[model samples]
Target chain A: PQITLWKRPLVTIKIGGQLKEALLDTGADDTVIEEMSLPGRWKPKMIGGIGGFIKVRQYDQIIIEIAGHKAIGTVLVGPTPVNIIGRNLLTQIGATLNF
Target chain B: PQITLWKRPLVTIKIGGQLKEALLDTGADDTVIEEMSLPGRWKPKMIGGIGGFIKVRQYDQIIIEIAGHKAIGTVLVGPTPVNIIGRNLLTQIGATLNF
Candidate 1:
């Protein structure tokens, strides 16, 4: 399946068995999600964005499902305004970007 | 033409008679470019992002061409780490998001 590069390119993704909407952000180096509970020991880290860098809890070996495709990768939970699926997970989910 | 979603969706764009590389960032609310001299009057403004918001020179009526498609829209210039072509301009070029 091909995803179009429309306004806000919103897509559905399931992480830790929870359904959520994430932006297909190729600009982001990593995937970021809002604060959530995860079963792992996360280290606090700072991530830079538009407004400013914020603290995030980095979790590893997380299972993510996007468009019925499953991928295992790092998922960062923090006070981010939005959830974004960056290139890290997008590549595993078979998402393609072309014009 | 369809773009494959890769590690980074880097695209070649022609702006103001200059060729440059930009990221197809769906998470961005507005298009932002590195500091560049443009021929026009711009006002100082602030924009928010993953790290933090920064002051930018907001320019209107910019002609951006992506993948051989031409679109006219608002472009922001600032001290950004990367040049991102946001949804604001992507729509004008008939780019769509689907999965």
Candidate 2:
């Protein structure tokens, strides 16, 4: 029997001036921020792509570092109740998904 | 002189078979679920409305009760790292936002 492992590397991000741990999900197309953890006046725009328009909320600019590489992007306030790391940042550093 | 308060009621919801609390945000057009709390085999469809397309992931069927009122709607998995409550469920219970 062959056992398949599905685990993605974790990325640490500082959201709303707070540090947080997140999983790098290549399946997702954008970054997500929890409304509870966001500061005021940081609003995100809806994203457009092959899937049409993606509704993004507001959040402050974030400082993210992954795999010893770092980049900055707007944290999209999400309606979902939790935080997630999408492909938006992963692809930037040439990250790949292994399943 | 009048003081304005912007406070919204928090709703308790069960995500991924676990009970959790969330805020009811009418300003938001959709719901969001935390990636950390979501279970398996639950995927949500992208929602279309005034702001264009909102990216939604997947989550199992959720049971929500707000202000003693309960209704069932697909929990929109968000890219953000946190959970949120949107207008989709608020309107169903005729809940009002007082700010």
Candidate 3:
């Protein structure tokens, strides 16, 4: 799939057996999802952005399906306006920035 | 130019007669540079993200050269860890997300 930058590059993703929309955020280092319940124990962590830092729960080896491609990685659950599919997961699905 | 997501998609940009390194941040709505001096009148603005909101100065019609390609758009100056080249400028350079 190829997405132009004319609009926000939002995509439908499957996570935790549910369909959700997320942004392919190259600026972020880790995938951060809006607060949700997931199985397994998670460690407390904090991530920083343009404004400041936020505390989150880190779940490892989470499976996520993005545009039909499946990827597994660490997922952070926190209070975010939108779900972000960051570079950590983007690399697993071979997403690139092209011109 | 095609950039893989294995690493941070950092690019060298020429802005305001000086060279600076910035990240190609698809998650960011507007380009934000680490507090810098730019010529012209700017308006006070506040932008939000995963963490919180940050106060910034918005300068429009700023020229930036990314990877030899030129783009002009609104640029924000504020307290940020790194400079971010968001979709506003990425669109001008015909950047896309591909897999």
Worst 10 residues of 1 chain A by lDDT: A1-10
Expressed as tens digits, the lDDT of each residue in B1-99 for candidate 3 is: 889988999999999999999999998888999977898999999999777888999999998999889998899999888999999999999999998
lDDT of 3 at A99: 88
TM-score of chain B of each: 0.93, 0.59, 0.97
User: Per-residue lDDT of A20-39 in model 1, one digit per residue for the tens?
Assistant: 99888777878899988989
State in Å the error of residue B87, model 2. 1.5
lDDT (10s digit) by residue, model 1, range B1-99? 656565566788889999999887777878999878887899888887776668899999998887788988899998777789888887777665544
Sort candidate 1 into its docking category.
medium
Maximum-DockQ candidate: 3
- Residues B24-43, candidate 2: write the lDDT tens digits: 44334556665555445766
lDDT of 2 by residue, A1-99 (tens): 111112223456665556777654432456676555555576557654222455667555566665445756656865543355655565555543211
Native-referenced Cα lDDT, model 2: 0.52
Ranking by TM-score: 3, 1, 2
Provide TM-scores for the models.
Answer: 0.86, 0.37, 0.97
lDDT per residue, candidate 3, A1-99, as tens digits? 889887888999998888999999999899999989988989999898866888999999999999889999999999988899999999999999998
* Alpha carbon lDDT at A81, candidate 3: 84
Q: After superposition, how far is residue A20 of candidate 2 from its true place, in Å?
A: 37
Order the numbered candidates by lDDT, best leading: 3, 1, 2
